[PDB]
C-alpha cells in the first residue's frame, strides 16, 4: 500500500496532477528493519 499526494499542488501547468509524491515502508538489508521512503511516480504508474 502506497500513500500518495500531489508533487506540486501549487501548479496550473499541464503537469498539474502528473507527478505524485508517495511514501513506502521498504525492506532493507536486514530482515528486522524497514525504511520510510519517499519517491516520485508518474500518474500512469499508480492506481487508487
Amino acid at each position: 500500500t502506497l500513500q500518495c499526494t500531489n508533487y506540486a499542488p501549487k501548479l496550473r501547468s499541464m503537469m498539474r496532477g502528473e507527478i505524485k509524491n508517495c511514501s513506502f515502508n521498504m525492506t532493507t538489508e536486514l530482515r528486522d528493519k524497514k525504511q520510510k521512503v519517499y519517491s516520485l511516480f508518474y500518474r500512469l504508474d499508480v492506481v487508487q
Partner: antibody
Framework: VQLVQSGAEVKKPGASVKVSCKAS????????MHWVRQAPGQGLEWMGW????????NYAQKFQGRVTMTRDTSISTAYMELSRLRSDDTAVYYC?????????????????????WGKGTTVTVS | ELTQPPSVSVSPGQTARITCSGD??????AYWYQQKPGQAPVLVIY???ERPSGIPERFSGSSSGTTVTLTISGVQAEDEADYYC???????????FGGGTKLTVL
C-alpha cells in the same frame, strides 16, 4: 512602464467618483487590470479586475453591484466607477497590471501577480 | 482568508521572519510585497519563494502546510516596511490579501 490614474476627488455619501487608469509603454490588451483599495491605516483590499480586451470582469463580493469596471481600448484606458459612496470608502484606489499568459505550449494558467502599479487615486467621502 | 502578524521587529542586521497563513494556501501560491508610506506596494517574492531579479539577495521565501514565510536576512533600515502576503481563495477565482505586517528596524 506606466499606469496613469485620475486625480483625487472629494464627495458626500451617496455620490460617485471615477478612477481612470491609462496604459503607457506596453500593449493595453493581453493583461488584466486589477483594482486594489487601501483605506488610511489599512492593508490592501482586492476589489476586482477587468479584461481590457473582452470587457469581462471579476469582482470581490464587497464591490459587486457598487463598483462598475469598464474600459476603452481606443484610448488604452481602464476605468473604475465607484457609486453609492460611503464615508467608509475613504481610501486610495490603485490600478495594477498582472503578468501576461504563461504559455507552456498552447496554455494560459493566469497566475496572479500585481507589480505594475499606478500611484493611486485618493477618494474621500465625507 | 489570510492572517499575518500586525508587526515584527529586528535590530539592523538581524533576520526578519514574516509569516502568513490560511486554509487555501496548501494549493495556492503566495506572493509577498514591500510597501512604504507614499507608494504602491512592490513584489519581493513570487510563487512562494522566487526573487524577481531587481530584489536583493537579502530576500527569499519558503512555505509549508498552510503557512508561507518571507525572510529577510541582514535587514537594514531601508527595509522598514509593511509586508503583505497575497494569494487566492480556494476556488482560485478571487484574489485575497493579508492585513500587512509592520517590520520595524531598531
Amino acid at each position: 512602464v506606466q499606469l496613469v490614474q485620475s486625480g483625487a476627488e472629494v464627495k458626500k455619501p451617496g455620490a460617485s467618483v471615477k478612477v481612470s487608469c491609462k496604459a503607457s509603454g506596453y500593449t493595453f490588451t493581453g493583461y488584466y487590470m486589477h483594482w486594489v483599495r487601501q483605506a488610511p491605516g489599512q492593508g490592501l483590499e482586492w476589489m476586482g479586475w477587468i479584461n481590457p480586451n473582452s470587457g469581462g470582469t471579476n469582482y470581490a463580493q464587497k464591490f459587486q453591484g457598487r463598483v462598475t469596471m469598464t474600459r476603452d481600448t481606443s484610448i488604452s484606458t481602464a476605468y473604475m466607477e465607484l457609486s453609492r459612496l460611503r464615508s467608509d470608502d475613504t481610501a486610495v484606489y490603485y490600478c495594477a497590471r498582472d503578468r501576461g499568459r504563461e504559455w507552456e505550449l498552447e496554455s494560459y494558467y493566469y497566475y496572479y501577480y500585481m507589480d505594475v502599479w499606478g500611484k493611486g487615486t485618493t477618494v474621500t467621502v465625507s | 482568508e489570510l492572517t499575518q502578524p500586525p508587526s515584527v521587529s529586528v535590530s539592523p542586521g538581524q533576520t526578519a521572519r514574516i509569516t502568513c497563513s490560511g486554509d487555501a494556501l496548501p494549493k495556492q501560491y503566495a506572493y509577498w510585497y514591500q510597501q512604504k508610506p507614499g507608494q504602491a506596494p512592490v513584489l519581493v517574492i513570487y510563487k512562494d519563494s522566487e526573487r524577481p531579479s531587481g530584489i536583493p539577495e537579502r530576500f527569499s521565501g519558503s512555505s509549508s502546510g498552510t503557512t508561507v514565510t518571507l525572510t529577510i536576512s541582514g535587514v537594514q533600515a531601508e527595509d522598514e516596511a509593511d509586508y503583505y502576503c497575497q494569494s487566492a481563495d480556494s476556488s482560485g477565482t478571487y484574489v485575497v490579501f493579508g492585513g500587512g505586517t509592520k517590520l520595524t528596524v531598531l
